[PDB]
Structure formats: structure tokens, C-alpha cells
Design an enzyme around this catalytic site. Structure first.
Site, PDB file in Angstrom:
ATOM      1  N   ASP A  75      -0.106  -7.642   1.838  1.00  0.00           N
ATOM      2  CA  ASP A  75       0.416  -6.239   1.786  1.00  0.00           C
ATOM      3  C   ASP A  75       1.930  -6.205   2.018  1.00  0.00           C
ATOM      4  O   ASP A  75       2.400  -5.864   3.089  1.00  0.00           O
ATOM      5  CB  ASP A  75      -0.298  -5.395   2.872  1.00  0.00           C
ATOM      6  CG  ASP A  75       0.054  -3.895   2.827  1.00  0.00           C
ATOM      7  OD1 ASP A  75       0.481  -3.448   1.785  1.00  0.00           O
ATOM      8  OD2 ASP A  75      -0.129  -3.253   3.844  1.00  0.00           O
ATOM      9  N   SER A  81       3.886   2.962   8.129  1.00  0.00           N
ATOM     10  CA  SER A  81       3.452   2.020   7.033  1.00  0.00           C
ATOM     11  C   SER A  81       4.655   1.412   6.320  1.00  0.00           C
ATOM     12  O   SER A  81       5.518   2.193   5.970  1.00  0.00           O
ATOM     13  CB  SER A  81       2.675   2.752   5.944  1.00  0.00           C
ATOM     14  OG  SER A  81       1.687   3.553   6.586  1.00  0.00           O
ATOM     15  N   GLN A 130      -0.261   5.764  10.444  1.00  0.00           N
ATOM     16  CA  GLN A 130       0.120   6.122   9.040  1.00  0.00           C
ATOM     17  C   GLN A 130       1.490   6.834   9.073  1.00  0.00           C
ATOM     18  O   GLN A 130       1.771   7.673   9.914  1.00  0.00           O
ATOM     19  CB  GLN A 130      -1.008   7.044   8.398  1.00  0.00           C
ATOM     20  CG  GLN A 130      -1.608   8.057   9.425  1.00  0.00           C
ATOM     21  CD  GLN A 130      -2.804   8.862   8.842  1.00  0.00           C
ATOM     22  OE1 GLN A 130      -3.794   8.350   8.343  1.00  0.00           O
ATOM     23  NE2 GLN A 130      -2.768  10.160   8.885  1.00  0.00           N
ATOM     24  N   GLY A 131       2.332   6.478   8.138  1.00  0.00           N
ATOM     25  CA  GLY A 131       3.714   7.097   8.071  1.00  0.00           C
ATOM     26  C   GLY A 131       4.712   6.015   8.484  1.00  0.00           C
ATOM     27  O   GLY A 131       5.830   5.979   8.021  1.00  0.00           O
ATOM     28  N   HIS A 157       0.849  -1.219   0.000  1.00  0.00           N
ATOM     29  CA  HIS A 157       0.000   0.000   0.000  1.00  0.00           C
ATOM     30  C   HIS A 157       0.870   1.250   0.000  1.00  0.00           C
ATOM     31  O   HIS A 157       0.368   2.350  -0.041  1.00  0.00           O
ATOM     32  CB  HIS A 157      -1.007  -0.037   1.221  1.00  0.00           C
ATOM     33  CG  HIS A 157      -0.514   0.297   2.623  1.00  0.00           C
ATOM     34  ND1 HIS A 157      -0.006  -0.511   3.480  1.00  0.00           N
ATOM     35  CD2 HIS A 157      -0.505   1.505   3.292  1.00  0.00           C
ATOM     36  CE1 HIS A 157       0.295   0.102   4.576  1.00  0.00           C
ATOM     37  NE2 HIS A 157      -0.003   1.369   4.505  1.00  0.00           N
TER      38      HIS A 157
HETATM   39  N1  BAH Z   1       0.225  10.547   2.495  1.00  0.00           N
HETATM   40  C1  BAH Z   1       1.029   9.541   2.724  1.00  0.00           C
HETATM   41  N2  BAH Z   1       2.290   9.647   2.394  1.00  0.00           N
HETATM   42  C2  BAH Z   1       0.563   8.337   3.322  1.00  0.00           C
HETATM   43  C3  BAH Z   1       1.451   7.227   3.507  1.00  0.00           C
HETATM   44  C4  BAH Z   1       1.072   6.016   4.099  1.00  0.00           C
HETATM   45  C5  BAH Z   1      -0.231   5.925   4.507  1.00  0.00           C
HETATM   46  N3  BAH Z   1      -0.803   4.906   5.077  1.00  0.00           N
HETATM   47  C6  BAH Z   1      -2.035   5.272   5.286  1.00  0.00           C
HETATM   48  C7  BAH Z   1      -3.071   4.285   5.978  1.00  0.00           C
HETATM   49  O1  BAH Z   1      -4.312   4.936   6.216  1.00  0.00           O
HETATM   50  O2  BAH Z   1      -3.347   3.305   4.989  1.00  0.00           O
HETATM   51  C8  BAH Z   1      -2.597   3.585   7.339  1.00  0.00           C
HETATM   52  N4  BAH Z   1      -1.455   2.944   7.500  1.00  0.00           N
HETATM   53  C9  BAH Z   1      -1.474   2.512   8.740  1.00  0.00           C
HETATM   54  C10 BAH Z   1      -0.524   1.787   9.418  1.00  0.00           C
HETATM   55  C11 BAH Z   1      -0.814   1.459  10.745  1.00  0.00           C
HETATM   56  C12 BAH Z   1      -2.026   1.856  11.389  1.00  0.00           C
HETATM   57  C13 BAH Z   1      -2.308   1.498  12.714  1.00  0.00           C
HETATM   58  N5  BAH Z   1      -1.575   0.581  13.295  1.00  0.00           N
HETATM   59  N6  BAH Z   1      -3.296   2.073  13.340  1.00  0.00           N
HETATM   60  C14 BAH Z   1      -2.953   2.605  10.624  1.00  0.00           C
HETATM   61  C15 BAH Z   1      -2.627   2.906   9.326  1.00  0.00           C
HETATM   62  N7  BAH Z   1      -3.316   3.567   8.447  1.00  0.00           N
HETATM   63  N8  BAH Z   1      -2.256   6.505   4.852  1.00  0.00           N
HETATM   64  C16 BAH Z   1      -1.127   6.932   4.358  1.00  0.00           C
HETATM   65  C17 BAH Z   1      -0.784   8.157   3.777  1.00  0.00           C
HETATM   66 MG    MG Z   2       8.378   2.607   9.635  1.00  0.00          MG
HETATM   67 ZN    ZN Z   3      -0.102   3.144   5.867  1.00  0.00          ZN
HETATM   68 ZN    ZN Z   4      -4.972   4.880   8.353  1.00  0.00          ZN
HETATM   69 ZN    ZN Z   5      -4.385   7.065   5.298  1.00  0.00          ZN
END
Ligand code: BAH
Ligand code: MG
Ligand code: ZN
Ligand code: ZN
Ligand code: ZN
Ligand code: CA
Length: 223
Positions: free
Chosen positions: A84, A177, A174-175, A40
């Protein structure tokens, strides 16, 4: 990472920051030429940054290398986030040293209860937005599949596991990820998803890397 602590500069030497003009995901170095991250986190135009601690300051131990190729898992489902995982090949091989090192892939899967270290430059506020410049760490145990599945009915597959705290307060976000979940010296998970971050009864969900070792080994040897 919410409720974690500052790791310390280069204390997680296999941690990578994926940059497409800014940091957007983490990753793990598995050998001088390959990185594993989450599917992702797929984008075109990725530069991999090794030896980072403050991602906004060039402190002297970084290596910025462009990716030559990305391979998203053949069965990745973006709707359920099943499978993923993605592999990134570097244009040049990284120079490994104390500050840049690779992490080992697991020989077996890890047991619920095992403590792991999760790290990244992702959001640090459950309610809010605060992005750190230095690497944040978090120790969390793997949760039983039963508490994982009760928190997310019909959404958990055999390629996923939850790690965290059901009380909330500590989680990856997020970040973070694509980042690593290391337990007993092996890369056991990849930061994949969750319901918001650090919410009570909503633990983080991670890609179960032990189910992909033969795919990884075969893919890198043939590319
Ligand atoms: N703008 C970006 N550069 C970005 C990068 C990665 C992202 N990933 C998400 C997510 O929304 O897909 C997302 N990655 C997650 C990882 C862990 C958890 C958690 N453990 N609560 C929740 C998460 N949500 N949005 C994102 C936005
Ligand atoms: Mg990391
Ligand atoms: Zn993420
Ligand atoms: Zn998220
Ligand atoms: Zn997100
Ligand atoms: Ca830096």
C-alpha cells in the site's frame, strides 16, 4: 489522529495534504518533485498542498500544486492492502524552505521499540467523528511483529508493521491515510490501515517503507 496533540504550525514540514476539492489523505514530500502516499488513497484529479497547518485557512505558507502522474505500486492488493504505497509526481517542483522540506528515505529498517512521529488531519474520535483543521501529531513506538500478528492473524505480511498502543486510546485513523511515520529522521512507514481507530488490542498497521527504497528510487529516476 486519536489521542495526539497539535503539532504546531509547520513543525512537520514534509507533511502534505492531498486534496480533490477537500482533504482526503496525507502524504510525504521526498524531494521537490515527488510525494509518497498510500495506494488506497489513489484518485484521479489530485492537488498536493504543502506548507499547510490549518487546511481551511490560507495562512501564507502554502503551495498548491497539481500532480502530473500517480504510480500505484505494481503489486498493490486492495483486498489485503499489501504493498500500500503510491508515488505522485508534481507538475512543478516545490520551493523548499523552512516550512516545506523533504524527508529522507531510510538506509535500513527500524527496530521494534523505536519511537516514531505520526501526523495528519484525520479523525480524532475513536467512537465518533471530529475532523481537525490543524495538524495533529502522535508519538508511538513500533510494536513487535508478534503482537502485531496476534492482533491480526493471517493479515500481516512482511511489508507491514504495527505501531501504537495495545491498550487503545492513541492511533492514526482514516484521513491520516498515506501520511508519514518518521522514526530517527527517516520515513519508515505510511499510514495504511487498522480495525476502527484507537481500539484496545487493534494497533495501526503501516506500510514498511524500507522494503521499497529501490523501487522508489528507480521509479522516480525513470519518470
Ligand atoms: N472519504 C475519504 N476521503 C477517505 C479517505 C481515506 C480513507 N481511508 C479509509 C480507511 O478505512 O481505509 C482507513 N484508513 C486508515 C488508516 C489508519 C487506521 C488506523 N490506524 N486505525 C484506520 C484506517 N482506516 N477510509 C477513507 C476515506
Ligand atoms: Mg497524514
Ligand atoms: Zn485510509
Ligand atoms: Zn478505516
Ligand atoms: Zn474508510
Ligand atoms: Ca492553510
Amino acid at each position: 489522529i486519536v489521542g495526539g496533540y497539535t503539532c504546531g504550525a509547520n513543525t512537520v514540514p514534509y507533511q502534505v495534504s492531498l486534496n480533490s476539492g477537500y482533504h482526503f489523505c496525507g502524504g510525504s514530500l521526498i524531494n521537490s518533485q515527488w510525494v509518497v502516499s498510500a495506494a488506497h488513497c489513489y484518485k484521479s484529479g489530485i492537488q498536493v498542498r504543502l506548507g499547510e497547518d490549518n487546511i481551511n485557512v490560507v495562512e501564507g505558507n502554502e503551495q498548491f500544486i497539481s500532480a502530473s502522474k500517480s504510480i500505484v505500486h505494481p503489486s498493490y492488493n486492495s483486498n489485503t492492502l499489501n504493498n500500500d504505497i503510491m508515488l505522485i509526481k508534481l507538475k512543478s517542483a516545490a520551493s523548499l524552505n523552512s516550512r516545506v522540506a523533504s524527508i529522507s528515505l531510510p538506509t535500513s529498517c527500524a527496530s521494534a521499540g523505536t519511537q516514531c512521529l505520526i501526523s495528519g488531519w484525520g479523525n480524532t474520535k475513536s467512537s465518533g467523528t471530529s475532523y481537525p483543521d490543524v495538524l495533529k501529531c502522535l508519538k508511538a513506538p513500533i510494536l513487535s511483529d508478534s503482537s502485531c500478528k496476534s492482533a491480526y492473524p493471517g493479515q500481516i505480511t512482511s511489508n507491514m508493521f504495527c505501531a501504537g498502543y495495545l491498550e487503545g486510546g492513541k492511533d492514526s485513523c482514516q484521513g491520516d491515510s498515506g501520511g508519514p511515520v518518521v522514526c530517527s529522521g527517516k520515513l519508515q512507514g505510511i499510514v495504511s490501515w487498522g480495525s476502527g481507530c484507537a481500539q484496545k488490542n487493534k494497533p495501526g498497521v503501516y506500510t514498511k517503507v524500507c522494503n521499497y527504497v529501490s523501487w522508489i528510487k528507480q521509479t522516480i529516476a525513470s519518470n
